[PDB]
Amino acid sequence: SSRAKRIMKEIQAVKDDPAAHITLEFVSESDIHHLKGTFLGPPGTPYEGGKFVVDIEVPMEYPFKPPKMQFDTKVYHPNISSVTGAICLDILRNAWSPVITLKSALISLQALLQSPEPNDPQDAEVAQHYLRDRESFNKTAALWTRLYASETSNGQKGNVEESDLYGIDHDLIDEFESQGFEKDKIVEVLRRLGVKSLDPNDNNTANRIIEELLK
């Protein structure tokens, strides 16, 4: 479209050969109204290490066109994800420059994710909670992003794990096998249960498993 060309030009830069580590995929019919800019990055921090999908909404207005952004890996940060997915970066609550393109808003999130700013954020509950238990939220933060880094197809409520190569076969078997029980034992107890987050020497299900294992 005519007005769409405005945003298309911005995406052309990222489309110019795999470079800049940027991503821009619009999910809409001929009338591109909803934009979605993602960014791929390696690990090395609980705030970064996977994929991020920022739901962008680009209207058809030239004068003062503030690009909306929300959700984005539902990251739990004082800035991102306050109640139903919302960030605070220039063009969000009070922009001070109409030149701040969409690329700036996206790139700003990357540096923002790896930059704790609990001084004067938007979410007081998060800031106060992080101020006390920062180490407890740190680990939980990396886990959420590590699991919500990407998702195939649509969803009903929540589809986490149970998609890639399953590690529940000979690993859980090797434990009971060497113990003294035979494969036929583990299979019988594994098939019925079918746990995934099993512990070596700290699992309740295990005790119950071995219970039958001996019969």
Which CATH number fits the domain that encloses residue 9?
3.10.110.10
Place of tokens 């794990």: 161
For residues 79 and 87, give the distance between their C-alpha atoms in angstroms, rounded to a whole number: 5
Q: Are residues 75 and 152 in the same domain?
A: yes
Elucidation method: NMR
Residue 38 DSSP SS3? strand
User: Which of 135, 158, 181 is a domain's end point?
Assistant: 158
Residue 145 CB neighbours (<10 A): 24
Q: Which of 7, 11, 22, 88 is catalytic?
A: 88
Q: Are residues 30 and 98 in the same domain?
A: yes
Q: Which residues contact 25 (CB under 8 A, 6 or more apart)?
A: 36, 37, 38
For residues 194 and 75, give the distance between their C-alpha atoms in angstroms, rounded to a whole number: 30
Q: Are residues 68 and 44 in the same domain?
A: yes
Q: Could you give the number of structural domains in the chain?
A: 2
Reply yes or no on whether 88 is catalytic: yes
Q: Are residues 172 and 152 in the same domain?
A: no
Q: Which domain holds residue 204?
A: 159-215
Sign of CA dihedral 117, 118, 122, 125: positive
Q: Are residues 172 and 151 in the same domain?
A: no
Q: Which residues contact 82 (CB under 8 A, 6 or more apart)?
A: 122, 123, 126
Q: Are residues 141 and 176 in the same domain?
A: no
Q: Are residues 48 and 98 in the same domain?
A: yes
Place of tokens 């800035």: 79
Query: b/e string for 58-87 if b means 16 or more Cβ within 10 A?
Result: beeeeeeebbbbbbbbebbbbbbbbeebbb
Tokens of 195: 């746990």
Tokens of 204: 């309740």
Q: Which residues contact 175 (CB under 8 A, 6 or more apart)?
A: 186, 200, 206
For residues 160 and 175, give the distance between their C-alpha atoms in angstroms, rounded to a whole number: 26
Q: Are residues 154 and 174 in the same domain?
A: no
Which CATH number fits the domain that encloses residue 186?
1.10.8.10
